[PDB]
Every structure is written in structure tokens, then in C-alpha cells.
């Protein structure tokens, strides 16, 4: 049983994040600039894909 009362608690650290378009870093959702220097702290961020 998934128990959705624990799914959203688990989804806080698993899927509700952001992905940098350049260095693929996993980022906080409401962040605007990536924390990785190698991509130059770019602003091209996307939401993390969820399963269908």
C-alpha cells in the first residue's frame, strides 16, 4: 500500500525537485539559478519529470 499520507512526505525529497538543463543537477523546486559553478550558475531550469 502506497499510503499517500506518506507518499507526499517521501515525494518531498524524491520527485518535487528541479533539474538543470546543462549539468543535470538536482535542484530545489522554486530555485532560479543552479548552484553548480561548472554550468556557470545558469537559469535554464526545468521541473523534475513525474511518472506519467
Amino acid at each position: 500500500i502506497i499510503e499517500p499520507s506518506l507518499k507526499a512526505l517521501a515525494s518531498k525529497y524524491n520527485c518535487d525537485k528541479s533539474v538543470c538543463r546543462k549539468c543535470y543537477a538536482r535542484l530545489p523546486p522554486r530555485a532560479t539559478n543552479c548552484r553548480k559553478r561548472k554550468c556557470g550558475h545558469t537559469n535554464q531550469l526545468r521541473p523534475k519529470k513525474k511518472l506519467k
Binding site: 502506497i2 499510503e3 512526505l9 517521501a10 518531498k12 520527485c15 511518472l51
Partner: protein, 191 residues
């Protein structure tokens, strides 16, 4: 642009006492004693009226000014940790394999072992930091409670449990397994 004067205040409550020796803050309260070495920040402390402490930065840049506010928050965290305490609560989530966590003792260290995580035969051991009291929760299914005085010692010991039970080579969005923080509160009641 080299702000000439930026300053933050620190409110000290009734029962606790703060002593500072040139950067060394010692907060002593009902729940115990907390000491911190802040010798890498270069701020200036001053006592005003025995119930309020002011921290001042003179001729600091934007980065150095940004290190002023974190000083007040670290001292306040030390203050609230010795009056109200810090209490972290986690929940165990699993689909098929019941996670078995027990308190063990090797060489007088009080490790935390994890068993039956995703059917793994490996026993992951987590050492309890000094000052953190681990107690298994009652009347709630699969809940652990971390209690202590230092917030950076409870949360870091908490982070060790969350990062030791990771899932590899699988879909994280499907295998919802781990030891995740449910609520960060305080030890004392009514607040």
C-alpha cells in the same frame, strides 16, 4: 559598497546565561551547556542590559555583512536548544519489506542498525552523536524520535539516517523507500 555599520540584536531569556571570551560563546541553561567556536567570522559582541546582546560589524562588504545574520541565528539556535530543546521525528516508509531498526552497542558507542531495507542482507550501522537521545516512538507505526540540545548535532545525526538508506539502480519515483523527516519541532510541550 562597504556598509559602515550593520548590527543585529540577540535576545536572551530568563534562565539561561551567555558568556563570550573574544569569540567563544558559551550558552548555559536548564537543559545543559553548549559551546561554539566562532573564530572564523570576525564580529564584535557587546552586552547591553543583561537581557539583550548586540552584535556589530564595522566596515564590512556584502559577503561579510551576510555573515552577520547567521551569527545571531546560530546563537539563537543554541539558546532555544537549551530551553525548548530540539526534537526530530521521522517515519519509516516501505512497500513490502518491514524495516527493522534497533539500538545496539559496540565498544560503548550506541550504534543504530538498519535491517531488512529492500530485502538487503547488509546491516547499515549509524553512530549516535554525543548529546542526541534516540527513543522509539509509541502509538505511531514506524516512528523514531531524535532529541537533544544542539540543533546541528541532532539534525546531522538525523541526516545520517536519511542518507544511509538510499535506493540505487531503481526508479526513485516508484520505490518510495527511506527514512525521511516528518516534523522538526521542540522537546518541551505547549510550544
Amino acid at each position: 559598497m562597504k556598509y559602515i555599520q550593520t548590527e543585529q540584536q540577540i535576545e536572551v531569556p530568563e534562565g539561561v546565561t551567555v558568556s563570550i571570551k573574544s569569540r567563544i560563546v558559551k550558552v548555559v541553561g536548564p537543559r545543559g551547556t553548549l559551546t561554539k567556536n566562532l573564530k572564523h567570522i570576525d564580529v564584535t559582541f557587546t552586552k547591553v542590559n543583561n537581557q539583550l546582546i548586540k552584535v556589530a560589524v564595522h566596515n564590512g562588504g556584502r559577503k561579510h555583512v551576510a555573515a552577520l545574520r547567521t551569527v545571531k541565528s546560530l546563537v539563537d539556535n543554541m539558546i532555544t536548544g537549551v530551553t525548548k530543546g530540539y526534537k526530530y521525528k521521522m517515519r519509516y516508509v516501505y512497500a513490502h519489506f518491514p524495516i527493522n531498526v534497533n539500538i545496539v552497542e559496540k565498544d560503548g558507542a550506541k550504534f543504530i542498525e538498519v535491517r531488512n531495507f529492500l530485502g538487503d542482507k547488509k546491516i547499515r550501522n549509524v553512530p549516535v552523536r554525543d548529546g542526541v537521545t534516540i527513543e522509539f516512538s509509541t502509538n505511531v507505526k514506524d516512528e523514531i524520535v531524535l532529541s537533544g540540545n544542539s540543533v546541528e548535532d541532532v539534525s546531522q545525526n538525523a541526516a545520517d539516517l536519511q542518507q544511509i538508506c538510499r535506493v540505487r539502480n531503481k526508479d526513485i519515483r516508484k520505490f518510495l523507500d527511506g527514512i525521511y523527516v516528518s516534523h522538526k519541532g521542540f522537546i518541551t510541550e505547549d510550544l
